[PDB]
Design a protein around this ligand. Structure first.
Ligand SMILES: Nc1ccn([C@H]2O[C@@H](COP(=O)(O)OP(=O)(O)O)[C@H](O)[C@@H]2O)c(=O)n1
Ligand SMILES: [Mg+2]
Length: 403
């Protein structure tokens, strides 16, 4: 819903300084970006600004959850700066803080065409407006300090842009408290909301949802809301053992069992049933002797049970084939969460096999949407997508200027 908000295509940025909230919270290992998808997604708004005559583009984001303590040794945005520079073909001035004297001066009037990335916002308790101390307790933020944090951010540009879709569910100071006459939705913000609004309000049918993940209790709302829209639905990952234990009394050994979500499984199945949704659960498995990448692997079916002391970490071949048949009937697919422990090659086969079917479906004309160009749309969303789909309002979209 961006018919009534100001958006970038209309903002005149010529000779103007631009502050842009983006989502550069990327997955990392050992100070190394493991996935630069969130960085690439931000490129077209940045380019447009630079191309249209921007004095400067100042970029701000969080990374991980450092809970209002500075952690530049574990959670620094510096690695992103180096990545952004290559992608952009431009120099990137990395600043080691996000508010204050040094930052405001550095951004006061940069050389024409400067791209500037600030340090992790969540190094300041005032970004969330709450935090944890070094003894792990409930530290309250100070209103006067929040007003100062925000007022410092409002200095780094003449105009504001939110291209931060992956964070749009967060009412944080960088997301709703920036004070400037013009607050615009960037091109990503627009692309994301257009794909998910078309997918949900004029779906191509048959419409398939694939939902995977570890726990059930936290997806009740998602599943319910999806169950009113979709023609089919796959339920996969460690969340399916809860389902199979209740609907089939499968012996799951040490596989994950959501004791709470177990009590409403019945109601989900009942609403699916009355709505005519076909529920596709896994029927076989790759089992492991412990929660380890280098565990000993086995195999099991619903008929056979998983032996005791062993746990299920990936669906198997016959489950793969079942998933594929739903993929074949679909004209639209929304996929959220893995069907197994794809992190680990031994347990990655189900997700790979499945990605292939979804890719092949795209070639025939299926609209395929996956969570954060072989598919229609790879979302940066993940957690914000889930809230989009639970029907809830996005603090990041609501705070943009009205026309
Ligand atoms: N036994 C298990 C354990 C984890 N998982 C997957 O569960 C995913 C995360 O669980 P989650 O529900 O808390 O988060 P999402 O899948 O919604 O992103 C991890 O990426 C694992 O690959 C699984 O499918 N089966
Ligand atoms: Mg969750």
């Amino acid at each position: 819903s961006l018919s009534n908000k100001l958006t970038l295509d209309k903002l005149d940025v010529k000779g103007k300084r631009v502050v842009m909230r983006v989502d550069f919270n990327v997955p990392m290992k050992n100070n190394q970006i493991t996935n630069n998808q969130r960085i690439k997604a931000a490129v077209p708004s940045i380019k447009f600004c630079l191309d249209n005559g921007a004095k400067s583009v100042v970029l701000m984001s969080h990374l991980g959850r450092p809970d209002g303590v500075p952690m530049p040794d574990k959670y620094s945005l510096e690695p992103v700066a180096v990545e952004l520079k290559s992608l952009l073909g431009k120099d990137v001035l990395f600043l080691k803080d996000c508010v204050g004297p040094e930052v405001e001066k550095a951004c006061a009037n940069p050389a024409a065409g400067s791209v500037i990335l600030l340090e992790n916002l969540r190094f300041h308790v005032e970004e969330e407006g709450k935090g944890k101390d070094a003894s792990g307790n409930k530290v309250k933020a100070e209103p006067a300090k929040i007003e100062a944090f925000r007022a410092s951010l409002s200095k780094l540009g003449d105009v504001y842009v939110n291209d931060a879709f992956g964070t749009a569910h967060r009412a944080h100071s960088s997301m709703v408290g920036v004070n400037l006459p013009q607050k615009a939705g960037g091109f990503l913000m627009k692309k994301e909301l257009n794909y998910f609004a078309k997918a949900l309000e004029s779906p191509e049918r048959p419409f398939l949802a694939i939902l995977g993940g570890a726990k059930v209790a936290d997806k009740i709302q998602l599943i319910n809301n999806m169950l009113d829209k979709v023609n089919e639905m796959i339920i996969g990952g460690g969340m399916a053992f809860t389902f199979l234990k209740v609907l089939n009394n499968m012996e799951i050994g040490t596989s994950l069992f959501d004791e709470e979500g177990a009590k409403i499984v019945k109601d989900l199945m009942s609403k699916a049933e009355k709505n005519g949704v076909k529920i596709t659960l896994p029927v076989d498995f790759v089992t492991a002797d412990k929660f380890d990448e280098n565990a000993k692997t086995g195999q099991a079916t619903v008929a056979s049970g998983i032996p005791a002391g062993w746990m299920g970490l990936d669906c198997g071949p016959e489950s793969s084939k079942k998933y594929a048949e739903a993929v074949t009937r679909a004209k639209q697919i929304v996929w959220n969460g893995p069907v197994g422990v794809f992190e680990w090659e031994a347990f990655a086969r189900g997700t790979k096999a499945l990605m292939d079917e979804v890719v092949k479906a795209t070639s025939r004309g299926c609209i395929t949407i996956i969570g954060g160009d072989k598919v229609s749309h790879v979302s940066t969303g993940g957690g914000a997508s889930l809230e989009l789909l639970e029907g809830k309002v996005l603090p990041g979209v609501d705070a943009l200027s009205n026309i």
